[PDB]
RNA sequence: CGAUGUCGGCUCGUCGCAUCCUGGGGCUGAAGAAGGUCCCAAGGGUUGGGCUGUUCGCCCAUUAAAGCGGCACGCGAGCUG
RNA sequence: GAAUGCCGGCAUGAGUAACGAUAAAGAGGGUGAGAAUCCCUCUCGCCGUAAGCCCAAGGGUUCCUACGCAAUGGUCGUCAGCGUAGGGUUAGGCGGGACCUAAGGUGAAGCCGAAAGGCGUAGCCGAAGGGCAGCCGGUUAAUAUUCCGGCCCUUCCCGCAGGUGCGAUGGGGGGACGCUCUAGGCUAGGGGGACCGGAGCCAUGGACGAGCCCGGCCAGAAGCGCAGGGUGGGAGGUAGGCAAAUCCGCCUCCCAACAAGCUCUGCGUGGUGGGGAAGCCCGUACGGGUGACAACCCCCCGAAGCCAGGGAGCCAAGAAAAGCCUCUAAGCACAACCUGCGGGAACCCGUACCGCAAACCGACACAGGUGGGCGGGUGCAAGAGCACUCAGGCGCGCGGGAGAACCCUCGCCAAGGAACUCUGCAAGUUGGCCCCGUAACUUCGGGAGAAGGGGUGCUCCCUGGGGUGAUGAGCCCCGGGGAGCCGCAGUGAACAGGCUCUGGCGACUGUUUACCAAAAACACAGCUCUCUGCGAACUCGUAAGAGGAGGUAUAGGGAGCGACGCUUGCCCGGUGCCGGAAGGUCAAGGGGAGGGGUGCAAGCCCCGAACCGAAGCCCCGGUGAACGGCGGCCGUAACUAUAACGGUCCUAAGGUAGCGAAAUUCCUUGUCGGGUAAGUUCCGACCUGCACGAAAAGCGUAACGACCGGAGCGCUGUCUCGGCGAGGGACCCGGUGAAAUUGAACUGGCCGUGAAGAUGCGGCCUACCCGUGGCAGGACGAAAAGACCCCGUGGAGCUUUACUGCAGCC
RNA sequence: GAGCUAGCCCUGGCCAGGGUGAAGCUGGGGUGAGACCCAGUGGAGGCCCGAACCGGUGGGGGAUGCAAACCCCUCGGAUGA
RNA sequence: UGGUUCGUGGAGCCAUGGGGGAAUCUGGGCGGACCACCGCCUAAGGCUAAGUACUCCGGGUGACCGAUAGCGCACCAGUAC
RNA sequence: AAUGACCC
RNA sequence: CGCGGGGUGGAGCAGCCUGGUAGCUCGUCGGGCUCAUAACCCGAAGGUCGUCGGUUCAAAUCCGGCCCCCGCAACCA
RNA sequence: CCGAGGGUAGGGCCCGUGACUGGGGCGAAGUCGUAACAAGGUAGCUGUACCGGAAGGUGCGGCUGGA
RNA sequence: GUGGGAGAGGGUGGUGGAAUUCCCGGAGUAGCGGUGAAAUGCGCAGAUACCGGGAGGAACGCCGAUGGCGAAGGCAGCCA
């Protein structure tokens, strides 16, 4: 839906906030299962190695369930859907009959009170997790494992999915959010449905501060700098570059493919 | 204005203390040099309890 | 070049005369009045504004006239910038 | 004898500048060898959201007392933060440690690295965070939540007494959390009182009066009362909580739905204890006595604090561990644990004084810098603002006269009102509140405090709401109406927008050259390109490892552009990148036709042609929000002028839209029109654009701006054009007393001359010896071994299709 | 050597008093149901005025200074990047 | 690749990171590419006095200093600052 | 695979 | 003032560097197609190569001096 | 008290004029092309959109006022 | 009102085949495209033509009419 504001201030005239109506009466989270201390820090042991990180709201990590094959066969009741500061998506709090409480990343269409479960069994319904094999060709799916028993790694961003395209002996072909065509092992779990919160892309930050709230420090142009700092630094009053556009570290930034050629992963990929 | 000396007993101790110098080869040599020199004070005297 | 601060303005001046005005004079194609033009003469005078950093210049309203030039393109241990 | 030489000593400027905020002083009396400067008293002035008080940091003896003044103090010094000596810092409850965990550090296992060393789950360390039992008074010259008094607590250990399955570093629960706005009831704190207590006081015209003045509090266990916080009770089933569990979790039934009940805080009250003014008298540097058997009561205002884990809303989604409760395991159930009650035990370190400052950071008793808490009263709409002022603390460690110039800070001014100047720079005008009243334009929010106005004091009368109170008096908040008084003037002082029109740039709040640039630069939401399938790309590291990310294409890196509106044309020839299992070239290696050296030979050893050989390059393509680029010359219409039209050369393609003498226009003050009396600026146009142009974006845009340009009104010392007054210096007297500079000096003008600008040489002219206040023209005056310029086979930063390497990638 | 300065990490603190009045809620109105429109409440915002506090805009002083960045007047921000 | 006078040189010897990879006296290395002859040595384990270097320290001597010299310090100096 | 000066 | 590129029939361009021959397109002229004009078709004409000088057997071409034309440069002060 | 009017301040409507600029009407024999009327030599006309000296072309849908 | 009838009337969800294009494998050569005629273009780096597999979007042939439905604009594979 997206919340919109009137221009009672500049920067309030474009600003735009998510709709939280799917956030069920459960705004503060769940101890026990999560949260952990989350360790803010824009850099490695010592030095900054990703520029322009820092500031922005304190967070608690929700330790979510990315391998659903523990509770094969054990169903769970979806108890709530809550805000997760550390991902684009929303998260489902679910209660297993087992007693155990996990969070699943919350797919589009998930309703509270719903039944959900994981395993070879598993009715093909939104919320359920299955090894890729038993899932019908052509159904859209998410939180897909890359290699079996290694955890969900594909399609967890808000409003993303992959579609099952066909099969090939032990592998089923996937079409990933990027549009790539991937052979992913049959035995990999993946949960049916799309991610949801799909209006995430429609949000307009609206002002500088908002950027900072999310811990995004000001990014400065190479043009703004000096020859010591950047290939684009200097010279006089503005300058068009004077070389093929580059990163600060000298590599070209328009076109230069960067995936290493001889990756053994290659023989499992069929697209862009 | 604000000058450059902003005394702190803990800082002076953690920074220039006998135990800091002892911790690394760089520092151990400092004690060696100061000893051979005949320095009355190997490290700065940080006070208080 | 072990430093002579460099435009313009301002402030204060002072000097040259190849005189802008005033005083004296010759010639005039000088009727008179007003001019032209040369010579004598610097004692005093030589306005206020619009534009531009401007010097200069062009305008506006005047004036007896709105002189030219030197003084480290006079003058920053005097000011401005 | 010179090196702007090195070290030291003493000169010159010079009794000169200064003596560190313009808050301010005067006198009388003491002490003393010596008083503007020390003590005391009286008067005056200054601070008072401090210039007062309480903590933290830092400092470390500066605290208190006695004796002292050589030095230290910008003067003096009998004084001191100074010299000499002596004294002073008392804790189970305050803070820190025999408690916990944060970032981070360290680090067993483990990983890595020529060595040194780098990492690293556990653990350990790490605190203004969590945990934790003290309040009110009295005493010292100097310490007290520490000593003492009163009242109140907490831990251990040993006993008895009564309970129960007790029992872990292990399970769960809890601890436990954002921002903004907030209700109810309280406390802190403050105002009023005809009420209560009190020494006293009638002045100078009047008042012996609900007269003036002073004070009417503090703590306090149990128990109560008032607020408020926490929380459901049962019974079964159970596969989860990494062994167990009665615990938690999930499910299913019953009873509550409530704070009803348990509790747990806060506030009142409480046995009791403590304090208790002015004034008056004293002898202290200061405190003492009395006032007192002090009284210790009623209203009102009232928090930002408390009840606290209260409530509502919002998006950016808000530490951990221990203590604590509960569950059980090994064990043990003569142990053990819980509750009550006795007795006993309760260590280590800090405690002085300064602490917005003369004791901390600034070489100084330096006008600068320094985190937290309290910060009273009156008014002005409010307030921590402003004026005065409690408490308290100061008059800033040189003074006395004088009343020139000139300077600083300040006040006023005839007439004129920007004529000043690069510029209204500066300075004035404006100014709070209430009420009228407000345009273009606009993104419908705005522009707006538009502009422009009027009201503002005090008195008396009438009258409307609330709050606390019983529905009432009072006390306290907001209003309305009518008469009336005074002055030049009523936010009568102090605090408190000058306004408008129109361009440029940037959308906007923000950021920046600490110490000459706050901007039109940077950032910014948003737009596009491109890389990246996840052991991601990328960054750091030799590696291990880590960041990215406990993320996963709506995500992450790189690039440019930079809200938004309308748009962003053409060229892929060159360069870059992307795509091409053909082809050409292509190194080590494979291959050996063939040849060479030695041997009597077997042999041993050398070169070495075909041919098989990667990436890279060549070649074939694509690709512009990739690096980039986007022409010339002649002719032509029935007045001239001009050229819709045409020819021709060249390119990879020849600039579209929209702008345009512009932050861009050389010629140039282009040419018309506008503002002016007059306008190289400004605005509107024209287009001959030296040399605009579409994401190094193009043309626009409401709002925004300590940005930059032009205009007008208002107002003025900016000016014509100055004048006067004020205080701080300047000046004279007493005390203290520098500096750069300095070859030596007995240091005049003119015209000359001289290395070409002479006090010093020539000729003349002038001129008695020496100071004080002033002005700066000269001493090519001081200051800095010129910044600019060249020089040096001097040096650095930076760039690239300069050379040559290296990392990195292939 | 990060006790100055730049950034980030952990844990705390601070921001008087006034304005303006977004959403939402509630009531009324409109419709077949709506959209929407009026009140009232509510209290949003890199919103406004203004102390602390953080700055450093213009001018003047200071220039062997009080100060190797100071002082006066004036000005920007002040719930947020 | 390093070492040696040896910088790729006709480049051996000695050491070694990578690849291949023997022999036990009729076995192996060397005598400067290489081959023949003639010789010299016995690799792939280790220890081993003395002659040699140094002067914190003690002594001796000086065509060495004599307090701006001589050590930074003749003096309570790696102190004060 | 273009064009047909003016008025009548 | 400096630099380096340029003047060829009526128009626009080649031809030069490796000296001897001046060629392309348009236009002009004559004829044809058409009722006529243009388009189209067939034939033809047309160039002191800016001037001055000589180098050569011979100069559009090579070399000097001037003259117009175009483009660049004019910086540190 | 009110009050003609004068003054100051800001709006509303209307008239005139303005460098320059936009298209329009009209004016016997100037320029360029051929769009339409015959299947006008690409059926035309149409709304919209883009492009072009100019008529105009093209895309998309539509109409018979064409076969 | 009761009881019936035809229909491409509308909205939502799902689904079928023919064909075009692109990708992959096979087999296969010297030209294919295109027009008034050509050229641009694609193709010896393996094109066009043919077979097998896959991806994907769009529009529904025959039925079909000079037909039906709707207020017009307009409505056409099938299913609910
Ligand atoms: N004529 C009215 C409107 O304007 C235009 O028409 C105007 C012009 O286009 C037209 O110009 C024509 C030209 O088209 C035609 N081919 C040649 C003719 N000589 C010109 O003629 C014009 O100029 C001449 C002299 O100058 C005048 O005398 C004559 O009256 C006038 N019509 O002249 C008209 C002025 O009267 C539109 N084409 C027309 O269709 C439109 O309706
Ligand atoms: Mg690191
Ligand atoms: Mg480290
Ligand atoms: Mg940027
Ligand atoms: Mg820069
Ligand atoms: Mg670089
Ligand atoms: Mg430039
Ligand atoms: Mg360029
Ligand atoms: Mg550049
Ligand atoms: Mg010089
Ligand atoms: Mg000199
Ligand atoms: Mg000098
Ligand atoms: Mg004369
Ligand atoms: Mg005469
Ligand atoms: Mg004169
Ligand atoms: Mg001017
Ligand atoms: Mg003169
Ligand atoms: Mg001159
Ligand atoms: Mg001059
Ligand atoms: Mg001069
Ligand atoms: Mg200047
Ligand atoms: Mg000498
Ligand atoms: Mg000396
Ligand atoms: Mg003197
Ligand atoms: Mg003097
Ligand atoms: Mg003096
Ligand atoms: Mg003083
Ligand atoms: Mg006062
Ligand atoms: Mg002492
Ligand atoms: Mg003392
Ligand atoms: Mg004494
Ligand atoms: Mg003294
Ligand atoms: Mg003392
Ligand atoms: Mg500890
Ligand atoms: Mg370590
Ligand atoms: Mg610990
Ligand atoms: Mg604590
Ligand atoms: Mg304690
Ligand atoms: Mg004390
Ligand atoms: Mg006690
Ligand atoms: Mg138990
Ligand atoms: Mg626990
Ligand atoms: Mg009397
Ligand atoms: Mg009272
Ligand atoms: Mg268990
Ligand atoms: Mg009480
Ligand atoms: Mg008493
Ligand atoms: Mg709450
Ligand atoms: Mg622990
Ligand atoms: Mg102990
Ligand atoms: Mg103490
Ligand atoms: Mg104390
Ligand atoms: Mg303070
Ligand atoms: Mg001070
Ligand atoms: Mg000090
Ligand atoms: Mg002092
Ligand atoms: Mg402060
Ligand atoms: Mg207060
Ligand atoms: Mg008040
Ligand atoms: Mg006020
Ligand atoms: Mg004040
Ligand atoms: Mg005046
Ligand atoms: Mg006057
Ligand atoms: Mg006036
Ligand atoms: Mg003027
Ligand atoms: Mg003037
Ligand atoms: Mg101006
Ligand atoms: Mg001003
Ligand atoms: Mg302006
Ligand atoms: Mg503006
Ligand atoms: Mg800006
Ligand atoms: Mg700053
Ligand atoms: Mg600066
Ligand atoms: Mg600014
Ligand atoms: Mg500045
Ligand atoms: Mg944009
Ligand atoms: Mg990692
Ligand atoms: Mg992570
Ligand atoms: Mg990005
Ligand atoms: Mg930019
Ligand atoms: Mg473009
Ligand atoms: Mg190109
Ligand atoms: Mg290219
Ligand atoms: Mg190409
Ligand atoms: Mg390539
Ligand atoms: Mg080879
Ligand atoms: Mg070989
Ligand atoms: Mg190759
Ligand atoms: Mg122009
Ligand atoms: Mg003009
Ligand atoms: Mg004019
Ligand atoms: Mg203009
Ligand atoms: Mg230009
Ligand atoms: Mg530009
Ligand atoms: Mg561009
Ligand atoms: Mg821009
Ligand atoms: Mg700003
Ligand atoms: Mg600004
Ligand atoms: Mg004056
Ligand atoms: Mg005066
Ligand atoms: Mg005075
Ligand atoms: Mg004196
Ligand atoms: Mg003399
Ligand atoms: Mg001379
Ligand atoms: Mg002499
Ligand atoms: Mg002389
Ligand atoms: Mg004198
Ligand atoms: Mg002088
Ligand atoms: Mg002077
Ligand atoms: Mg001088
Ligand atoms: Mg020099
Ligand atoms: Mg050289
Ligand atoms: Mg720091
Ligand atoms: Mg509302
Ligand atoms: Mg604000
Ligand atoms: Mg403010
Ligand atoms: Mg405060
Ligand atoms: Mg100044
Ligand atoms: Mg301010
Ligand atoms: Mg070698
Ligand atoms: Mg070597
Ligand atoms: Mg060599
Ligand atoms: Mg080896
Ligand atoms: Mg060997
Ligand atoms: Mg060998
Ligand atoms: Mg040998
Ligand atoms: Mg030999
Ligand atoms: Mg040998
Ligand atoms: Mg051996
Ligand atoms: Mg001697
Ligand atoms: Mg010595
Ligand atoms: Mg001696
Ligand atoms: Mg010495
Ligand atoms: Mg024609
Ligand atoms: Mg006629
Ligand atoms: Mg002919
Ligand atoms: Mg220069
Ligand atoms: Mg008009
Ligand atoms: Mg036609
Ligand atoms: Mg047609
Ligand atoms: Mg047509
Ligand atoms: Mg059309
Ligand atoms: Mg077209
Ligand atoms: Mg194929």
Swiss-Prot record, chain A:
| Ranges of Basic residues composition bias in the record | 256-272
Query: What are the boundaries of the region Disordered?
Result: 222-272
Any one GO MF term held by the record is: transferase activity
Family classification: Belongs to the universal ribosomal protein uL2 family.
> What keywords are assigned to this protein?
Ribonucleoprotein, Ribosomal protein, RNA-binding, rRNA-binding
The question of whether Ribosomal protein is a record keyword is answered with yes
GO BP terms in the entry: cytoplasmic translation
Taxonomic lineage is: Bacteria, Thermotogati, Deinococcota, Deinococci, Thermales
The record ties this protein, via PROSITE patterns, to: RIBOSOMAL_L2
Q: What is the protein's known function?
A: One of the primary rRNA binding proteins. Required for association of the 30S and 50S subunits to form the 70S ribosome, for tRNA binding and peptide bond formation. It has been suggested to have peptidyltransferase activity; this is somewhat controversial. Makes several contacts with the 16S rRNA (forming bridge B7b) in the 70S ribosome.
Q: How does it assemble?
A: Part of the 50S ribosomal subunit. Forms a bridge to the 30S subunit in the 70S ribosome, contacting the 16S rRNA. May also make transient contacts with protein S6 during translation in the 70S ribosome.
What ranges does the record list as Basic and acidic residues composition bias?
229-239
Q: Which GO terms describe its cellular component?
A: large ribosomal subunit
Tell me what this protein is called: Large ribosomal subunit protein uL2
Q: Which Pfam families match?
A: Ribosomal_L2, Ribosomal_L2_C
Curated annotation (Swiss-Prot), chain B:
Q: Name one GO cellular component term.
A: ribosome
Which one of the record's GO molecular function terms can you name? structural constituent of ribosome
> What NCBIfam families does the entry give?
rpmH_bact
What family is it from?
A: Belongs to the bacterial ribosomal protein bL34 family.
Q: Which Pfam family is an annotated match for this chain, by its short name?
A: Ribosomal_L34
Alphabetized PROSITE patterns for the sequence? RIBOSOMAL_L34
Keywords in alphabetical order = Ribonucleoprotein, Ribosomal protein
Q: What else is known?
A: The open reading frame (ORF) for this protein is entirely within the ORF for the RNase P protein (RnaP). The two start codons are separated by four nucleotides.
Summarize the protein's role: Found on the solvent side of the large subunit.
Keyword hit for Iron: no
PANTHER family in the record: LARGE RIBOSOMAL SUBUNIT PROTEIN BL34M (PTHR14503:SF4), MITOCHONDRIAL RIBOSOMAL PROTEIN 34 FAMILY MEMBER (PTHR14503)
Assembly state and interactors?
Answer: Part of the 50S ribosomal subunit.
Q: Where is this region: Disordered?
A: 26-49
Protein name as annotated:
Large ribosomal subunit protein bL34
Where does the record place Basic residues bias?
Answer: 29-49
Q: Which GO terms describe its biological process?
A: translation
